[PDB]
Design an enzyme around this catalytic site. Structure first.
Site, PDB file in Angstrom:
ATOM      1  N   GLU B  62      33.922  56.085  31.300  1.00  0.00           N
ATOM      2  CA  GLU B  62      32.510  55.727  31.380  1.00  0.00           C
ATOM      3  C   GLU B  62      32.043  55.869  32.822  1.00  0.00           C
ATOM      4  OE1 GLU B  62      30.887  52.842  32.788  1.00  0.00           O
ATOM      5  OE2 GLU B  62      28.959  53.492  31.969  1.00  0.00           O
ATOM      6  N   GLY B 135      39.365  49.299  25.496  1.00  0.00           N
ATOM      7  CA  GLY B 135      39.826  50.536  24.902  1.00  0.00           C
ATOM      8  C   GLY B 135      40.416  51.507  25.902  1.00  0.00           C
ATOM      9  N   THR B 136      39.577  52.017  26.808  1.00  0.00           N
ATOM     10  CA  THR B 136      40.042  53.027  27.748  1.00  0.00           C
ATOM     11  C   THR B 136      41.135  52.490  28.661  1.00  0.00           C
ATOM     12  OG1 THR B 136      39.368  54.535  29.518  1.00  0.00           O
ATOM     13  CG2 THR B 136      38.136  52.478  29.310  1.00  0.00           C
ATOM     14  N   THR B 170      35.689  37.656  26.058  1.00  0.00           N
ATOM     15  CA  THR B 170      34.439  38.400  26.164  1.00  0.00           C
ATOM     16  C   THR B 170      34.202  39.303  24.964  1.00  0.00           C
ATOM     17  OG1 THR B 170      34.643  38.354  28.574  1.00  0.00           O
ATOM     18  CG2 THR B 170      33.104  39.936  27.629  1.00  0.00           C
ATOM     19  N   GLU B 245      64.245  46.385  45.340  1.00  0.00           N
ATOM     20  CA  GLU B 245      65.058  45.174  45.278  1.00  0.00           C
ATOM     21  C   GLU B 245      64.400  44.087  44.448  1.00  0.00           C
ATOM     22  OE1 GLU B 245      66.928  45.845  49.791  1.00  0.00           O
ATOM     23  OE2 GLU B 245      66.005  43.937  49.221  1.00  0.00           O
TER      24      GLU B 245
HETATM   25  N1  LIG Z   1      39.847  39.834  36.337  1.00  0.00           N
HETATM   26  C1  LIG Z   1      38.894  40.662  35.928  1.00  0.00           C
HETATM   27  N2  LIG Z   1      38.822  41.031  34.601  1.00  0.00           N
HETATM   28  C2  LIG Z   1      37.850  41.872  34.174  1.00  0.00           C
HETATM   29  C3  LIG Z   1      36.920  42.373  35.065  1.00  0.00           C
HETATM   30  N3  LIG Z   1      36.080  43.175  34.388  1.00  0.00           N
HETATM   31  C4  LIG Z   1      36.459  43.199  33.088  1.00  0.00           C
HETATM   32  N4  LIG Z   1      37.550  42.388  32.937  1.00  0.00           N
HETATM   33  C5  LIG Z   1      38.289  42.138  31.687  1.00  0.00           C
HETATM   34  O1  LIG Z   1      38.412  43.339  30.954  1.00  0.00           O
HETATM   35  C6  LIG Z   1      38.294  43.090  29.565  1.00  0.00           C
HETATM   36  C7  LIG Z   1      37.660  44.278  28.850  1.00  0.00           C
HETATM   37  O2  LIG Z   1      38.061  45.492  29.442  1.00  0.00           O
HETATM   38  P1  LIG Z   1      37.140  46.175  30.570  1.00  0.00           P
HETATM   39  O3  LIG Z   1      37.935  46.411  31.831  1.00  0.00           O
HETATM   40  O4  LIG Z   1      35.945  45.302  30.854  1.00  0.00           O
HETATM   41  O5  LIG Z   1      36.652  47.567  29.935  1.00  0.00           O
HETATM   42  P2  LIG Z   1      37.642  48.829  29.898  1.00  0.00           P
HETATM   43  O6  LIG Z   1      39.046  48.415  30.271  1.00  0.00           O
HETATM   44  O7  LIG Z   1      37.127  49.887  30.834  1.00  0.00           O
HETATM   45  O8  LIG Z   1      37.597  49.359  28.379  1.00  0.00           O
HETATM   46  P3  LIG Z   1      36.232  49.929  27.745  1.00  0.00           P
HETATM   47  O9  LIG Z   1      35.485  48.788  27.110  1.00  0.00           O
HETATM   48  O10 LIG Z   1      36.569  50.957  26.696  1.00  0.00           O
HETATM   49  O11 LIG Z   1      35.373  50.559  28.816  1.00  0.00           O
HETATM   50  C8  LIG Z   1      37.445  41.841  29.444  1.00  0.00           C
HETATM   51  O12 LIG Z   1      37.967  40.996  28.446  1.00  0.00           O
HETATM   52  C9  LIG Z   1      37.527  41.166  30.796  1.00  0.00           C
HETATM   53  O13 LIG Z   1      38.230  39.952  30.687  1.00  0.00           O
HETATM   54  C10 LIG Z   1      36.985  42.006  36.404  1.00  0.00           C
HETATM   55  O14 LIG Z   1      36.163  42.442  37.203  1.00  0.00           O
HETATM   56  N5  LIG Z   1      37.973  41.149  36.832  1.00  0.00           N
HETATM   57 MG   LIG Z   2      34.152  50.298  30.332  1.00  0.00          MG
END
Ligand SMILES: Nc1nc2c(ncn2[C@@H]2O[C@H](COP(=O)(O)OP(=O)(O)OP(=O)(O)O)[C@@H](O)[C@H]2O)c(=O)[nH]1
Ligand SMILES: [Mg+2]
Ligand SMILES: Nc1nc2c(ncn2[C@@H]2O[C@H](COP(=O)(O)OP(=O)(O)OP(=O)(O)O)[C@@H](O)[C@H]2O)c(=O)[nH]1
Ligand SMILES: Nc1nc2c(ncn2[C@@H]2O[C@H](COP(=O)(O)OP(=O)(O)O)[C@@H](O)[C@H]2O)c(=O)[nH]1
Ligand SMILES: [Mg+2]
Lengths: 160, 430, 430, 430
Positions: B62, B135-136, B170, B245
């Site tokens: 994305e 997902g990704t 979320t 290590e």
């Molecule tokens: N610690 C932390 N967790 C995050 C952050 N942003 C998203 N997350 C976690 O990531 C989870 C969802 O995956 P995302 O990283 O937001 O989205 P993605 O991994 O790119 O997967 P897609 O939805 O397909 O784009 C959520 O449940 C959040 O808890 C962040 O900035 N810090």
């Molecule tokens: Mg995303």
């Protein structure tokens, strides 16, 4: 010139395949020509269902319903989306096995042969007459004498 | 002549990569433009004259986050064509990013990895960051790990995954892809560190006294933990520790490599200097159950091995005098077949402060990486959440129609059951 | 990238679009002459989502307007922002349907639809990466409910993998303006379930109730209902046009809100909504937004959401705010109302944050929840349909254009089956 | 004491000659008037006091382009009577420009060539530019090459022909004259470089991010490639390469001299400086199949020999360290009978930027000239296009009536069949 029995059949099947490949409603903007060339050489699920519908196979029994065909397509298709010519032949053979599944006394080979007789593939003119579109016009924003005029030119013939 | 490559995939991965890359640039004196106005070599590479290029690659399908990166103040730092971006998002669907759109992107990422690896001569290992509940992120992380495990073989890979919180969530479908990704990285990653958001929220609330935190505050703490872990490779120390290590000291068995981290001290400048921050009190605070970086209770299980890093002006005798006190306490008990379980590292460079951030400047700090038997609770609760919806086959059609087979869900469940049985089998005394 | 095209049909859909495009243009700072006069850089970065580029620097919406009579499009052109629409996209007939579904779907709508499908194909083939289509139409009219739904099937047959949105206004029995509403509502619901990926029902009665009770304005007009619907429409795709903490395109919502492929009928609501005299009293905080978001009277449908249990829910916050507060409030709204949430799917609320608020507001929320309470609308529609059909009233108008009673019987049976199988999961227990 | 003469014939040839002659004048500091306000000698000649005269001649039968040249800002630069112009255009008819109107003009061009050659003392060779899909271009290029091959003999001639795209075409009859011109220059030109427009359009779209390119943008990239090729003759370098040192390194056999080019980096100033542009990444980008300057896939065939030029501050050891990485990759395979296939050149002068252009200023660049077995696909598709219309003898009457014999079409077909058989025979391993 001549073709082999599976191929004459193969030639007629390739003609059907190439026709239905071109009927695909491609969704998206600004394609590459490589993608257009690829999509002209593969059949999607909609065009495969259109083929089965035009040949009067789709929804004829419980084993060739829209859902059963979708499951079969995803299982045997290239990349789970597309059929090439070889996968299209395999899918027709699988559909033939499903379509005649209730006929227990038939071998799988006889089921495929019975399907090829049912679609009349051995007669190119009757087979081609069953090919139907989806849609195009040639871009022209459209809307007593409409009935056609076959202007038979007078033979300025051997006698004339 | 020692190098490490960090992989950032997904929105959470990129947003924590940004957080760690302000900190590294600040710690090595490199300006955001990449220009200095021999320790940099671990994370950077010299271009011959002038700027430095990070040994990092950013991945996402994305484009919004990458476009935000390519227009901020750090536009000049990263190489323009290592910020691989897609067009269509996986939309929280694991099958999409593992079977449909990730395959066409993974080849470019592998080419970039090769082009970065041929430059390094003493490659220690890989780092990877990915939020699991997407997902990704999960799908591409799984695919990249699977490709790297066969392209390179015995090179070490470390995974800083962020699992979902026990109750706070979320998405609504994140247990499915969390379980599948755990299946994928169980047999493919050498180290996995727990990072769920709820525990860090509680840490910020209790210590930093912030009542409205955002993701940046969480990512800064994670970046500090990463810097503390990798400080020993680029600074002089009385007791050094290398990445290689670890599997000889924290991983009793090949299956068991999930451990949870903690950090100390965490305190604001408004009340930091009123107390002396001795080594004993910080090493006591690090072992407090409420200061775990993952929402798990260590009092519910045994310890297996503790690897804990110091940095600053700490003296080894004070460290030993504090390890003895912890061994004394009756509320912390180790497993029977492990008489000594502590690995200690000491470094001289104090932690660096980021301007405008939360943490203050201190001369002593401690970071612990501890492997404990209590981690099985998160697996059990994720399994319980998964079973509730898998009983009725809910949301499965979104996965079957993306090329994944029906039976792929069951074997991940069987592997989790095997892992839970293994954790119970290990923790019983002889 | 990942842009969508706009297609609207009928008088009601044209009036909805006439305000939706005004709202979008005001959001992006586009003057009614197509010239950009905005203030912020972000106003132009993702303008390709809805607007095309032409010579001279002006922008033109990629909207397609269709109706069976020319009056409504001849009237919308003279309104504000009416010049933006390309004259080539206007397609119309000379006869009309007269609120008869058969005429707008079998005899007249079949011949005309080729021209509009030509321009639809022109628009979709050209665009960079298609995300999908969004459809606005009314189920209370003949030409709309016929031609729009047949166009849905035609589009789905050619683009099976893209996503499809429909904002559908269903005829409520309270405010009835047409006597033949049940027939073309029941016939349309039959076709709509088979092809639409998402459907969002909107009722004029609920809009009048909201305008009279929450805004407390004396004389509601169609302009206010259109403005509310337009704000709700814009709120869904905001994060696809602006950066944010957790971007979430339409496909991600499709994954997380539809458990089974036939359950895709949502009801929506927008917050905040306050009267002119009380806009100074209130203070905009996340608790204040979330308490109004789940309020029963705030739903855009007369369906009472405490008469059933939510299968899942979604929220799209706007503005700059802390994520910890959003997550804790979502947890609190789910712990205090456990009776109204289905128990075999835990953590069934999705949240997203976009850093760009609406023009004039500091915070805003769009709510999209899939609930079992929607059964009541189909129940009353089918009740009126079976009360009118048993005497074969007004049936000759439909049967004189090639339609028969068998298609009425099948439609009634399929609609009743949908009603039954939608509530089947309400009584399901783990 | 080293010179080269460039020949420009046809509209495309003149329009790319203009493009290269802004660049050379800018690179050597010469103002458009021809006045400077010892490296110039390769392309220019000193008149004794003041201005410099290019060693170039412009040919065309249609006067519009020459008249445009003779009134622009460069009216004072070129000698007034070396811009040979005709009266009647060939009108895309090859037989016209080879048999009817080109013969009466070719004598003046040959007289001009002699008058320019007698001035040079160290003549390295000739350059010629011509768009193949046109009447006058292909016909006059063929006739000039045939006259030069016998007037001078062993002097080297280089041809930068622009073949038609696989599917994109401007004319309808261009396969005929393309095949005939390929016949003519197969046995008469020492080097031929592929330049079809579609690949360069894709390059501009992907890298330069221009969505509406014109011919000038294409011609500027071609001019940059020419400058990179000929830089080694007029600037000091650590590893020099001459024009005569090509048929000994890139041409395994006298028949096989068609090769395709690539250039790197191609990037705009808006995002160029955010990444370090190391030599490894640019030499990786140059070998990417999507960055070929001709629309052919190198993955479909073997490589025979690669000659690739660097310029800037590149160090030879970094070049060797990158050639090793490319030899390592499994997706690029060389022919069996060629153990080493790389010829490397290094120059110190960085590429010059043209104001108001697309490319930004960079310190490192790479230009590759690679001979590969995959080039046979363009010949096969052009042959297939030719056969379709030659089966019914379409458009042949436009050629038979201009003095050409009926059998002349067949022997070009036989020579193409021979070339395709030769390419297959060479690529098989022993
Ligand atoms: N610690 C932390 N967790 C995050 C952050 N942003 C998203 N997350 C976690 O990531 C989870 C969802 O995956 P995302 O990283 O937001 O989205 P993605 O991994 O790119 O997967 P897609 O939805 O397909 O784009 C959520 O449940 C959040 O808890 C962040 O900035 N810090
Ligand atoms: Mg995303
Ligand atoms: N790359 C590039 N190709 C061009 C340009 N102009 C024309 N062409 C190509 O040239 C082909 C036709 O030949 P032209 O050069 O236009 O005309 P000509 O060679 O003078 O031949 P005549 O038609 O007889 O005048 C077209 O198919 C174009 O693809 C240009 O500016 N750049
Ligand atoms: N929100 C809104 N609804 C409208 C408007 N005009 C008509 N409607 C609704 O549309 C219904 C009639 O639909 P109709 O005009 O017959 O649709 P058509 O047959 O496609 O032209 C009525 O019940 C109204 O409630 C409008 O301007 N705004
Ligand atoms: Mg011309």
């Amino acid at each position: 010139k001549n073709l082999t029995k599976e191929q004459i059949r193969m030639k007629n099947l390739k003609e059907a395949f190439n026709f239905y490949c071109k009927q695909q409603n491609v969704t998206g903007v600004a394609f590459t020509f490589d993608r257009i060339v690829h999509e002209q050489n593969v059949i999607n699920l909609a065009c495969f269902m259109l083929f089965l519908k035009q040949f009067n196979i789709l929804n004829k029994n419980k084993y060739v319903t829209k859902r059963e065909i979708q499951i079969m397509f995803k299982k045997y298709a290239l990349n789970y989306k597309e059929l090439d010519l070889d996968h299209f032949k395999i899918m027709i053979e699988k559909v033939a096995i499903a379509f005649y599944k209730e006929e227990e006394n038939l071998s799988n080979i006889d089921r495929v042969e019975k399907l090829y007789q049912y679609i009349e593939i051995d007669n190119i003119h009757k087979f081609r007459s069953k090919f139907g579109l989806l849609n195009q016009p040639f871009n022209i924003q459209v809307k007593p004498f409409d009935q056609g005029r076959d202007i038979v030119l007078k033979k300025v013939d051997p006698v004339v | 002549m020692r190098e490490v490559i960090s992989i950032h995939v997904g929105q959470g991965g990129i947003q924590v990569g940004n957080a760690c890359w302000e900190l590294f640039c600040l710690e090595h004196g490199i300006q955001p433009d990449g220009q200095m106005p021999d320790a940099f070599n671990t994370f950077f590479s010299e271009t011959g004259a002038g700027k430095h290029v990070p040994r990092a690659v950013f991945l996402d399908l994305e484009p919004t986050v990458i476009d935000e990166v390519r227009t901020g103040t750090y536009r000049q730092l990263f190489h323009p064509e290592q910020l691989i971006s897609g067009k269509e998002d996986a939309a929280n669907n694991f099958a999409r990013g593992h079977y449909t759109i990730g395959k066409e992107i993974v080849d470019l990422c592998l080419d970039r990895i090769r082009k970065l690896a041929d430059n390094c001569t003493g490659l220690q290992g890989f780092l990877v960051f990915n939020s699991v509940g997407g997902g990704t992120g999960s799908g591409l992380g799984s695919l990249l790990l699977e490709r790297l495990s066969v392209d390179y073989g015995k090179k070490s890979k470390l995974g800083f995954t962020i699992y979902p919180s026990p109750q706070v969530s979320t998405a609504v479908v994140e247990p499915y892809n969390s379980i599948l990704s755990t299946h994928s990285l169980l047999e493919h990653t050498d180290v996995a560190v727990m990072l769920d958001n709820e525990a860090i929220y509680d840490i910020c609330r209790r210590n930093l006294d912030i009542e409205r935190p955002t993701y940046t505050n969480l990512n800064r703490l994670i970046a500090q933990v990463i810097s503390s872990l990798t400080a020993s490779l680029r600074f002089d120390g009385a007791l050094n520790v290398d990445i290689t290590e670890f599997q000889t000291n924290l991983v009793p068995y090949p299956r068991i490599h999930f451990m949870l981290s903690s950090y100390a001290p965490i305190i604001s400048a408004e009340k930091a200097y009123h107390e002396q921050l001795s080594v004993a009190e910080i090493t006591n605070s690090a072992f407090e159950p409420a200061n775990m970086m993952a929402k798990c209770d260590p009092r519910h299980g045994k310890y297996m091995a503790c690897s804990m890093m110091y940095r600053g002006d700490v003296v080894p005798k004070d460290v030993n005098a504090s390890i003895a006190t912890i061994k004394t306490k009756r509320t912390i008990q180790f497993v029977d077949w492990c008489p000594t379980g502590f690995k200690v590292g000491i470094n001289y460079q104090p932690p660096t402060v980021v301007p405008g951030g939360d943490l203050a400047k201190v001369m002593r700090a401690v970071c612990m990486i501890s492997n404990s038997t209590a981690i099985a609770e998160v697996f059990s609760r994720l399994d319980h959440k998964f079973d509730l919806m898998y009983a009725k086959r809910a949301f499965v059609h979104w996965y079957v129609g993306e090329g994944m087979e029906e039976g792929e869900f069951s074997e991940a469940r069987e592997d989790l059951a095997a892992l839970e049985k293994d954790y119970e089998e290990v923790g019983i005394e002889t | 990238m990942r842009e969508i095209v706009h297609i609207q049909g009928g008088q009601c859909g044209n009036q909805i679009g006439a305000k939706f495009w005004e709202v979008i243009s005001d959001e992006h700072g586009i003057d009614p002459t197509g010239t950009y006069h905005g203030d912020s850089d972000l106003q132009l970065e993702r303008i390709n989502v809805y607007y095309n580029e032409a010579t001279g620097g002006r922008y033109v919406p990629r909207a397609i307007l269709m109706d069976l009579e020319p009056g409504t499009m001849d009237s919308v052109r003279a309104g504000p922002f009416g010049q933006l629409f390309r004259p080539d996209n206007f397609v119309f007939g000379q006869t009309g349907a007269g609120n008869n579904w058969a005429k707008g779907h079998y005899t007249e709508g079949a011949e005309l639809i080729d021209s509009v499908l030509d321009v639809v194909r022109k628009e979709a083939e050209g665009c960079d990466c298609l995300q999908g289509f969004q459809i606005t139409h009314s189920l209370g009219g003949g030409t709309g409910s016929g031609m729009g739904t047949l166009l849905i099937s035609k589009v789905r047959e050619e683009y099976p993998d893209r996503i499809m949105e429909t904002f559908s206004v269903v005829p409520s029995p309270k405010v009835s303006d047409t006597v033949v509403e049940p027939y073309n509502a029941t016939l349309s619901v039959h076709q709509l379930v088979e092809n639409a990926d998402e459907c969002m029902v909107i009722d004029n009665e609920a809009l009048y109730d909201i305008c009279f009770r929450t805004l407390k304005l004396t004389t509601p007009t169609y302009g206010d209902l259109n403005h509310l619907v337009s704000a709700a429409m814009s709120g869904v795709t905001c994060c696809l046009r602006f950066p944010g903490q957790l971007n979430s395109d339409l496909r991600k919502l499709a994954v997380n809100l539809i458990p089974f492929p036939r359950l895709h009928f949502f009801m929506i609501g927008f917050a905040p909504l306050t009267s002119r005299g009380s806009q100074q009293y209130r203070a905009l905080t996340v608790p204040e937004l979330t308490q109004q978001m789940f309020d029963a009277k705030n739903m855009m449908c007369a369906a009472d959401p405490r008469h059933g249990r939510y299968l899942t829910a979604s929220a799209l916050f706007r503005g700059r705010m802390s994520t910890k507060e959003v997550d804790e409030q979502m947890l609190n709204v789910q712990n205090k109302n456990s009776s109204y949430f289905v128990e075999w799917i835990p953590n069934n609320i999705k949240s997203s944050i976009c850093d760009i608020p609406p023009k004039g507001l500091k915070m805003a929320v769009t709510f999209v929840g899939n609930s079992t309470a929607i059964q009541e609308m189909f129940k009353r529609v089918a009740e009126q349909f079976t009360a009118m059909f048993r005497r074969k009233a007004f049936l000759h108008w439909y049967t004189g254009e090639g339609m028969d009673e068998m298609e009425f019987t099948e439609a009634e049976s399929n609609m009743n089956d949908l009603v039954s199988e939608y509530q089947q999961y309400q009584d399901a227990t783990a």
